[PDB]
Amino acid sequence: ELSKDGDLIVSMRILGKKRTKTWHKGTLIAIQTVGPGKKYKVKFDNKGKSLLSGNHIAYDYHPPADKLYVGSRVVAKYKDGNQVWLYAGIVAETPNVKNKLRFLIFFDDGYASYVTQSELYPICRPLKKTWEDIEDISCRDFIEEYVTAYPNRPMVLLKSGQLIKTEWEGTWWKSRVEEVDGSLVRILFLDDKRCEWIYRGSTRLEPMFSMKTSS
Amino acid sequence: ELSKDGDLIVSMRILGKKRTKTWHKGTLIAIQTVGPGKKYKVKFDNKGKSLLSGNHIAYDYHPPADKLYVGSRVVAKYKDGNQVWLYAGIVAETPNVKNKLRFLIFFDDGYASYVTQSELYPICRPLKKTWEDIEDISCRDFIEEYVTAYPNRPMVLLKSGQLIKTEWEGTWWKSRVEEVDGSLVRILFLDDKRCEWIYRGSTRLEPMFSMKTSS
Ligand SMILES: CN1C[C@H](Nc2nc3cc[nH]c3c(=O)n2C)C[C@H](c2ccc(OCc3ccccc3)cc2)C1
Ligand SMILES: CN1C[C@H](Nc2nc3cc[nH]c3c(=O)n2C)C[C@H](c2ccc(OCc3ccccc3)cc2)C1
DSSP, X not given: OOSEETTEETXXXXXXXXXXXXXXXXXXXXXXXXXXXXXXXXXXXXXXXXXXXXXXXXXXXXXXXXXXXXXXXXXXXEXXXXXXXXXXXXXXXXXXXTTTSOEEEEETTSOEEXXXXXXXXXXXXXXXXGGGGOSSHHHHHHHHHHHHHTTOOOOXXXXXXOEEEXXXXXXXXXXXXXXXXXXXXXXXXXXXXXXXXXXXXXXXXHHHHHHHHOO | OBSEETTXXXXXXXXXXXXXXXXXXXXXXXXXXXXXXXXXXXXXXXXXXXXXXXXGEEESSOOOTTSOXXXXXXXXXXXXXXXXXEEEEEEEEOOOTTTTSOEEEEETTSOEEEEOGGGEEEBSSOOSSGGGGOSSHHHHHHHHHHHHHXXXXXXXXXXXXXXXXXXXXXXXXXXXXXXXXXXXXXXXXTTXXXXXXXXXXXXXXXXXXXXXXXX
């Protein structure tokens, strides 16, 4: 019965992670010391309840930009064009001139986007190695390499109109570069017209795959 | 050790459910008896492998319409911005005049959409009570009630431009009916301009939340 743990305190507003892997607002209604660490009981605003580890709760405020760094464990807004969801990720880039003063987020499922400071929430008790709670092993391993090598970031230069092969579902596909935005490129898959924003250091882009397998 | 279980045959193309709850093409590489039933080993096209229950694999073909019914357990195409994913659900409506010859799908996460016959795949070994493998209990219970009562479906009649309260994250929001499509309405949330398709029998729509209470 930990009524408090640092600035965590029962009755506070909080975000908690659900089994959809999206994050939702609620109230912290209990803290319990249990075996090695602590667990946080959240009552979500839709009345659901969950007992969560400290890396599965986030503060209901936007961190000051000067408290974030490459590797920071965050919850960020994800937008499909009509709906908005909150999903966990890693800060891959902080605001700078070339990225038009945005944060690049690497989400736990492998997606990447640029967001603003007002679209982020800090996870309360992230693991010492921030990537170690990423479920997708290929994503986890990529983040570990990326944060460890930062700022050494191999990327490929692409231009609008350029024709390249892009990976999807374990095979290569004919694709076209539609647009470049900072460290991201918008790829059109020519066969079925899906579009995707992809990190320019991703080995899903054949030139990066190659530039990295160049022997 | 089996090479065949009915028309599940080692080497066949298949869809398998991953931990993202999306479904992905692969090959059936093994059939194993483990404990009381069978498991199906799938090698995904990206070379990952999973040992899956029969309700977590689907055939890689579109079922004949008129072999689908209300309650059928299916995998359906979902549009996520400019991306397309496969996700499990239940058939809520079969093609008719009112729905412009489409299938209404109630997805396992509570979303609903109309799809065509070429956007569906049949799950290989669904449970006889097909909803019983839905993880979200509120969703599971809704589907059980819906299928049991079908065709008797309380729904509210809405028209484009109508202003109503719609529930989201446990509170009620000023919203507007933008469009009616069969048993779905497209709701604009006026505060933040999110848009969402919602079933006209959902108690997230204030008028339905009251029609139900009135009964
Ligand atoms: C960050 N990811 C992004 C993902 N998109 C995406 N990922 C990748 C990866 C490589 N490429 C791409 C790509 O192109 N995209 C477009 C959608 C994903 C998501 C997950 C659950 C959910 O659940 C919604 C929900 C439903 C019911 C109740 C609560 C929540 C909604 C969205 C979040
Ligand atoms: C069917 N549901 C629909 C859901 N949308 C949605 N649901 C609800 C529920 C009430 N309302 C709404 C609403 O408005 N929406 C818009 C997105 C959800 C999804 C899940 C995972 C995923 O993962 C993508 C992925 C990423 C990396 C690797 C593999 C896969 C992509 C999409 C699927």
